[PDB]
Design a binder for this molecule. Sequence first.
Ligand code: COA
Ligand code: OAA
Lengths: 438, 436
Amino acid sequence: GSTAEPDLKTALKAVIPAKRELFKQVKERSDEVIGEVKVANVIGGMRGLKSMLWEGSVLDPEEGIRFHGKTIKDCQKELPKGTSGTEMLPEAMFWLLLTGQVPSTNQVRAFSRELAEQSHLPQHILDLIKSFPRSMHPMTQLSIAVAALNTESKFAKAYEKGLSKADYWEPTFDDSISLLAKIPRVAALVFRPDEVDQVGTQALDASQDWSYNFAELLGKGGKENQDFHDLLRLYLALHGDHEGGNVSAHATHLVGSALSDPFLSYSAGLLGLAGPLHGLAAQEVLRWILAMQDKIGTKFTDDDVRNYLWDTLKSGRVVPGYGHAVLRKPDPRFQALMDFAATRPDVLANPVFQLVKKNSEIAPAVLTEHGKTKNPHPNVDAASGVLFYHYGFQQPLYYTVTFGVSRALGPLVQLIWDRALGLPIERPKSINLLGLKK
Amino acid sequence: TAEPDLKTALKAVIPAKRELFKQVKERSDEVIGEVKVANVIGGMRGLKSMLWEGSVLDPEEGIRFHGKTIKDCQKELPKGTSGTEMLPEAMFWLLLTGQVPSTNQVRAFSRELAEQSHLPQHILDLIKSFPRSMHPMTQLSIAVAALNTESKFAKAYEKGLSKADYWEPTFDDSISLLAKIPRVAALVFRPDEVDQVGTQALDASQDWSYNFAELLGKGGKENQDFHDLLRLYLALHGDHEGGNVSAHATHLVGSALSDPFLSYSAGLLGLAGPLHGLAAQEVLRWILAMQDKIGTKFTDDDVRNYLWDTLKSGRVVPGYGHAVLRKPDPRFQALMDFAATRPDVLANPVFQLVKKNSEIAPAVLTEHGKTKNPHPNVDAASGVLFYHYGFQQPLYYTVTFGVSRALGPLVQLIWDRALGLPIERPKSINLLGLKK
Ligand SMILES: CC(C)(COP(=O)(O)OP(=O)(O)OC[C@H]1O[C@@H](n2cnc3c(N)ncnc32)[C@H](O)[C@@H]1OP(=O)(O)O)[C@@H](O)C(=O)NCCC(=O)NCCS
Ligand SMILES: O=C([O-])CC(=O)C(=O)O
């Protein structure tokens, strides 16, 4: 007889009927008015309009993101850690997002083993990646390679053969796990174009966690890189989900709603994450900080930072990494990253980190006095790029690739639930300016 | 001696649109609708929540393009140097500017599209890496994204571009993608001829549909009937307001300032879905499977039995239903009217089966009681007309839709950037939050 606790699919099966029951109850109230649509919502990219379902996370505009009601600090305490290190595992975060429950350490160990076993790639993906020119932006590469993995889609094949609507969730789950397992390897291939043959075939240690094995594929394996492993765990867990309305989450849900499989759907998500106003912001923050360091020097005072911020604003440009579309108060994800740095003397001594820290103390008041930026707290993008830079990722165009790995987590969870609940195609109505004029 | 070109014609109508936009924005606080639980749990169905300038879909009347019906466009838009069907590049002109171009203007724009059609070597190399198992829409989506190496917008933005000047590089990239996408599509159709098809000159005097046909191996005077089908087809599928998945995904990814190549790649990944553009492929597979089961000599009840088998199996009847339309789709009727004057098409047994199913399936769907619209959509009829003209692999049918559906969404990206529309970012909620 087996000794193991329930695996992830089994844990999911245990909670599907309860969610379907809740859905049925909500659907009885279909006709209830919950809001107003204004002209502003139409011309303003649906800002503030409650118009989509998302189960795993809810952004409290006053307190930051919660995952099934849990704060970041709650998850940091409760979720399992790796065999070494102190940071919460992203694969534990996935478990939580999907099931609504905190897994045991033993359950996470078993799930980590599955992810290691399912990480190999078809040879055509290696051929595809070798065809990319050096001029191709790393996010273009990543989006294409993920779409190309649709050759491996169980959902696409099952649907082509004739699949009942009731049976959509299971192959969606299977494809989601497959994509999760493979995406760090794909991302490593984007980072390491001269090592595609080795990185693309190397066996992972099946007893190590997803972030550790990503690090190994990036060339940062072993005990000497233990702090980087913990950075990566924390980073990947923090960026996994940020409710449904952000562009990458939304795009994934939207394309998935037409019953495109999870590889095509998350490829659309990645194309959104490649936008300057969404996932590329972390790349822009770090470029901006290095350009500030170049102009003010390393002897900088508070006044030098204040003057630089004012010059930036007087020039009609933004201070990147400050502000948010929805959250109006300090980002707990930002604080989590700064607290990771607090206990690492080598990071605290990095002059580029010291500049990020000082800027985070001074900028919010300057931005407030200026009055053009709403919600002028530092967001998580203020800190993430510098931490990667510290650990030797100093290629200006690659920072969003790691975000792409993380942001598979939440949107894939919602695709599984979308299919389990039977949600229909996302298809709103449009109107033209003439029609709004009356 | 030359009439205004497309960019110039666009520049002339931008100020009036910006004036209209300002007038609308003064009324930002006007309530125009209600959000209900149904809208949240039901994929935004019935929620009027996004802007789209070039077309507006009436649930009862079908699509209008700047207030014009399909029949209006068929009569008014310029034709090719041969044939009687409206040109898709004329449709693009109309969608973008709001004005019907002269024939001379269309001829000049067609020549630009032919000139801008060539592909860089790395795109040919990428395509030759595709395995034979790869679905044609996966191929098309990837190759379009890969063309982002050629994006003027992406490069200009990276260098520092003022918001007021976003539209011009967006326009330039849109035209580049339009010019290139039929050649990309032909490479998907012709995997063993990438080197030749990927470099061959287009006929500089011919229209966009003609040159697509030639790249597909259906050039010349002997294929003039097919060129007219293709013109009509490409024009009909160009735009269907903003809320369809491919249009919406293009707008959504574009709204984060991803360039037109990345944004329309996202559109194509949506168009690849069984409930959206892949339904054209799905229809013909289902029609052929029905023909195989019921035979050559069959009754109405044999067709009914096949429809009910599909429904009882938990599957959709492809080519029936629509998110917005509540009557038979006038794009469907335009394709059936194309067939109506061609005795060889009407006599094709696969066409006869599509026609018979269109007389039976709406009643079956009504009896079943799930669908809000039992009537045929355009996907019921498109694939069989390609089949008749010799395109007999249904896994490629959506690729031609991919070529057509660049037209409308690229127009809206240009206007999105000209007007300065912001990122699309709704708010979500969980079921527990709706229950409270
Ligand atoms: C076009 C389509 C996606 C619109 O979706 P929609 O707006 O959610 O459709 P409805 O409001 O009519 O859906 C209500 C129910 O009817 C079902 N239904 C709709 N069209 C159907 C069809 N053609 N065959 C079987 N069932 C259908 C839906 O799947 C849904 O099921 P549920 O309530 O049991 O969960 C849908 O009609 C469809 O799937 N059609 C077949 C695919 C197709 O032809 N697509 C191309 C459209 S141009
Ligand atoms: O939430 C948003 O709108 C943007 C986002 O994904 C993030 O901040 O992680």
